[PDB]
Amino acid sequence: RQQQQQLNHEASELLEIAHIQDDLLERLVADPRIPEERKAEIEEFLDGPIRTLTDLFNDYADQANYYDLCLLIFHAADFHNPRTIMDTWNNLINQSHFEAEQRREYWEIVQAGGDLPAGVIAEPPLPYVYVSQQIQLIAHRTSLDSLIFPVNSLLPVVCAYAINNGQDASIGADPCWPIQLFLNLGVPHALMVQVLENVLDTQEAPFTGRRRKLVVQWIAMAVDMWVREVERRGAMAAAVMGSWVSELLGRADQVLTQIAGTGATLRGGAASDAEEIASLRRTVKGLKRSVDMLLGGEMARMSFFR
């Protein structure tokens, strides 16, 4: 069995590298922004024996700014470097945002009569939709167990992008879209709330001032899903949550009381979000109630008939 596994493992690693190399070669040959003279040179060195991950990264993936394949390379190489990983995530998000904005612009010109730039093939997804498509494609290929998904660093970055680029209600997007994304991808509920707590305590920009209203809304949505999950898992077994989650919702209520007060005394006139915040207060209290009941004994009596 040992000799079998060692060969199955060598073939699995070399197959992972080979697919990366094939994805690169195909993309480079098809890229409009690559001169023909270079493409023939790329085809010579990549359509043959499998190359090392260093070369694939330095000589090709990094030169062409294929940041998604850079991340797959950091995964195949067991690359321990959080800072470079996050730099690559930041470049991939920004590159995709600019590409989505460009395609929506070209569209708006068609729907208005103008002419596109020469050699531009004529309702493309909003930028936050194309961005999260890129995150999904990588996650399914790396399985979320990778070091290219440090949720403690990657979730705040994605939330930062949503704020600093208005990927919120103004354009008709769900303001909780970053949370939906990582939950559906299979991030455990406890880890989400744990990170969101750290976002709220440290107050790193842009998560500052009255925009912590949005952080509280993410916490509300995450805890809500967590509660639903626990209730579902209890019914499941008929046929972890600590007091820290309750404390976190209390502080969240205090943040909302602070934001509303500051909003009422702003220069130029009171803030327009008065009832929007009052609603969030009710939701947060409802969640603290549910969490308090579960913590207080209703969680050990979930498999029992009522």
Binding site: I34, P35, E37, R38, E41, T52, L53, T54, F57, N58, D59, Y60, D62, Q63, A64, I73, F74, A77, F79, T84
Partner: peptide, 17 residues
């Protein structure tokens, strides 16, 4: 085994020779 070396590469956007 990966080793990044931004120093000396080959200009991916220039022909050879």
């Amino acid at each position: 085994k990966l080793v990044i070396n931004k120093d000396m590469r080959t200009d991916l956007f220039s022909p050879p020779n």
